[PDB]
Design a protein around this ligand. Structure first.
Ligand SMILES: OC[C@H]1O[C@H](O[C@H]2[C@H](O)[C@@H](O)[C@@H](O[C@H]3[C@H](O)[C@@H](O)[C@@H](O[C@H]4[C@H](O)[C@@H](O)[C@@H](O)O[C@@H]4CO)O[C@@H]3CO)O[C@@H]2CO)[C@H](O)[C@@H](O)[C@@H]1O
Ligand SMILES: OC[C@H]1O[C@H](O[C@H]2[C@H](O)[C@@H](O)[C@@H](O[C@H]3[C@H](O)[C@@H](O)[C@@H](O[C@H]4[C@H](O)[C@@H](O)[C@@H](O)O[C@@H]4CO)O[C@@H]3CO)O[C@@H]2CO)[C@H](O)[C@@H](O)[C@@H]1O
Lengths: 475, 475
């Protein structure tokens, strides 16, 4: 778990070839004596910024490149400066993905795009268009099958459809992304989303479909199609299914336009093992043998390493991946990407479920994606009472504001309570959103039993913290 | 995510039928208007006690019953008092598993035991004994296969072997478990472990084998045998494999003796939805239809509900589960179970890898399993400096002690740093174990850039917290 001199800790997502990566680690250990521990914590991409600067992260973090600009802006990443000879071993466009403010911030590993994955026995002539899928589903349902299942809970999987007829994240102009010019609520985006929503209302898909439901349904031969990336191919191979990987369907005659990720490896700026990390990545992983070991576990996609990619490129599944990639767009790496994703995630889910209209959902995503970040300097937190007797209550009031002093309407707040002794009895109300932007309250009732101090910390937007204390006394 | 009046949040492990459970939730929602959100956080069993009492848990927690005594001791669980008619619908021994200090603390759902799962094409006559497996592996390796792969990283999977020839957790006598009488280092336990270790050294298994490696190897037809529970059967069915589920091999002519878990559902004492939770569990889940929906996703094992179990019991896989269960032991539910597991986990891993001898590994597990818990009242935490100028360092010293004032040698300490502004530059050393029991130090160097206050909290044994603060000032 712990970062220490002389050992390497690596975090990679649980859908990737972590076992194969650990094999590369074993080889490094054999040669160097340096143990390499590969972990796949949930929410690693959220945890990393919280722990990296405060002494508790991995030495190396793997994620798609979209997360890395935010990390770099915060100073969390070592600058990557490989020799020209090494740089020349990887595709130039992959280095571009991991460049932030003129500096290389990670090593590129592999290029990922979603494709249409289809069952050749059920559906050897997969549809050209999205909009026929409902009629197709009707046909399949009459023989115990469904047309299509994919993960509706992650916006990555729905974006290609939202983008097909013109939806965009941030407008690109004059050498940069305009962080206030968000394209999620344009005509093209509302449509794509509407379409999905109609698929649902018409009982072709289920709003609750997640990664595991879709994977199981495809791999068991129950659904004719899924939308997934190269990492998914291994489990399909394990199954009995004869599958193809192809171009995503069109929408309004336009290609679906997936957001393309470059799986990337960053080095923690606070690591005492930066040089070892670089050696591991450059000399062990980013080799034919190293990438093969990871790929054999879960396929990587179109790898960044030219020598190995030249071999993979022959695979029709890879050719299809690259085709879909070329029809989409390489994700920005800017800090605002997470805000964009969080916003779109909420809009797809809310709409799919009919908890809001498409017009409304997407209008709101636009606001939230473009929102300023909370400022520690202007955010307020107080409690009305710092000592409680049994039966007394204290209320926390917090008001979250940006750098300009303007409220931030939607904010992630993580509450943590530190307890002196675990002997006192306490009741916590919900964190209540009040009827003005940025304002939340929480009621805490001391019920006695034992004297106990508690310290309540609110972490805002997975960044800064404010804290209050309560002394519970029996008298 | 959040606990709120009028909605249900459920936590269940990611290896269980969470999608099927969500289906039961949908039915409840249809009837009642109460949304049911099923989550599968990693480490849910560790998180639950940390958040349940402090206003941030689920309404309902699912885990095997072994975890629940600790939760109950801490006051985290609502007492369960179903009508006699309802009680009579479930097997008596399952209620016994969820009784703590004379009170029912959860609803029993299903009985789980590990079995030997084997590939009928590769190995239709699976071995009787463990000790022949190495020779068998030799035969299989000569035809591109291995004999056996199972999760070595979780002690649950190795326990049946450790226990076969007499290993035990806590001695049971006079109506109770003796928490100071730990059986992990007896002759029978050292042997079983030694055997596994020899399997490894002789290249029959790999010390690094985890759940996913083993699952993939079995399901792809690469390994003849695995050790797993009923939840695993779904993915095997998806694969091409013809498999059987049978009695675990013997060791020294003794049955392997798995620790048997009762998957159980507890209600958070702090839930404002206790009655809804009870209705969901009693009236929706613990019905033929409800359990079927979960079972169809991932098999539950031998369910607690007699009416449904009578149907399942016909399944030879269930018969085998029950056979292995009867050869093992129902886990204690006492608070000390987690300490036991943590200890055995470290001993298996350390030994399997050859980082310690079996004799040593198991001697140490014994000490740690029997150890007193840290006391908030006697644990020390201080920092030598509470204000720093740039280039100055402060050192935290903590000394962890039990209720009696005795040091606790091994302690889990989770460090969290709350940051005022994220503008200061700080360097954190490792948390250093000093050369006497219970004592740890950490060096923090302020590097300037900006004035910033940080608050550093140490949480001990996932229980109490102590905190210090540092004001970093440029002057
Ligand atoms: O509370 C909501 C959820 O929040 C967390 O998920 C967030 C991430 O933190 C964001 O970074 C973002 O995720 C993007 C991701 O950055 C992007 O690369 C892409 O992810 C693909 C990935 O490239 C691919 O290799 C493979 O792993 O599939 C991923 C998709 O699942 O797309 C993501 C958006 O879908 O936004 C999400 C929220 O949507 C947290 O992890 C969740 O547990 C939490 O529910
Ligand atoms: O830091 C080490 C690891 O710590 C955490 O794992 C702990 C758990 O918190 C403990 O409760 C215990 O786990 C037992 C578990 O309580 C017991 O029921 C059994 O679990 C079976 C389960 O019954 C079955 O249904 C299925 O899910 O498989 C489980 C086994 O994986 O056995 C467990 C012990 O193997 O001890 C473990 C540590 O071993 C934390 O979750 C980990 O992430 C962490 O690495």
């Amino acid at each position: 778990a712990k970062i220490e001199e002389g050992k390497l800790v690596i975090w990679i997502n649980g859908d990737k070839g972590y076992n194969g990566l650990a094999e590369v680690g074993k080889k490094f250990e054999k040669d160097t004596g340096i143990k390499v521990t590969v972990e796949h914590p949930d929410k690693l991409e959220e945890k990393f910024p919280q722990v990296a600067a405060t002494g508790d992260g991995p030495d190396i973090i793997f994620w798609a490149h979209d997360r890395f600009g935010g990390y770099a802006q915060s100073g969390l990443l070592a600058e990557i400066t490989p020799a020209a000879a090494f740089q020349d071993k990887l595709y130039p466009f992959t280095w571009d993905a991991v460049r932030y403010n003129g500096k290389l911030i990670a090593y590129p590993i592999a290029v990922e795009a979603l494709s249409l994955i289809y069952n050749k026995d059920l559906l050897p002539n997969p549809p050209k268009t999205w909009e026929e899928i409902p009629a197709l589903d009707k046909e399949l349902k009459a023989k115990g099958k469904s047309a299509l299942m994919f993960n509706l809970q992650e916006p990555y999987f729905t974006w290609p459809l939202i983008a097909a007829d013109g939806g965009y994240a941030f407008k690109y102009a004059a050498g940069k992304y305009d962080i206030k010019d968000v394209g999620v609520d344009n005509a093209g985006a509302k449509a794509g989303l509407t379409f999905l929503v109609d698929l649902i209302k018409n009982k072709h898909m289920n709003a609750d479909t997640d990664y595991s439901i879709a994977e199981a349904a495809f791999n068991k031969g129950e659904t004719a199609m899924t939308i997934n990336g190269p990492w998914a191919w291994s489990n399909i191979d394990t199954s009995a299914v004869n599958y193809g990987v192809t171009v995503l369907p069109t929408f309004k005659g336009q290609p679906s336009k997936p957001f393309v990720g470059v799986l990337s490896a960053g080095i923690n700026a606070a690591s005492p093992n930066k040089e070892l990390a670089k050696e591991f990545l450059e000399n062990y992983l980013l080799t034919d043998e190293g990438l093969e070991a990871v790929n054999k576990d879960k396929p990587l996609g179109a790898v960044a390493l030219k020598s190995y990619e030249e071999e993979l490129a022959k695979d029709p599944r890879i050719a299809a991946t690259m085709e879909n990639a070329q029809k989409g767009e390489i994700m920005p790496n800017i800090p605002q990407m997470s805000a964009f994703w969080y916003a779109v995630r909420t809009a797809v889910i809310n709409a799919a479920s009919g908890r809001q209209t498409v017009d409304a959902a997407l209008a709101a995503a636009q606001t939230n994606a473009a929102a300023n970040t909370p400022s520690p300097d202007l955010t307020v937190m107080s409690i009305d009472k710092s000592v409680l007797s049994p039966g007394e209550s204290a209320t926390i009031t917090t008001i979250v504001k940006d750098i300009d002093g303007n409220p931030v309407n939607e904010v992630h707040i993580n509450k943590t309570v530190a307890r002196e002794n675990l002997k006192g009895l306490w009741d916590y109300g919900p964190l209540k959103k009040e009827n003005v932007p940025g304002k939340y309250t929480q009621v805490i009732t001391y019920r006695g039993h034992s004297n106990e101090r508690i310290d309540i910390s609110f972490k805002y937007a997975m960044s800064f913290t404010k804290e209050i204390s309560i002394r519970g006394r029996l008298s």
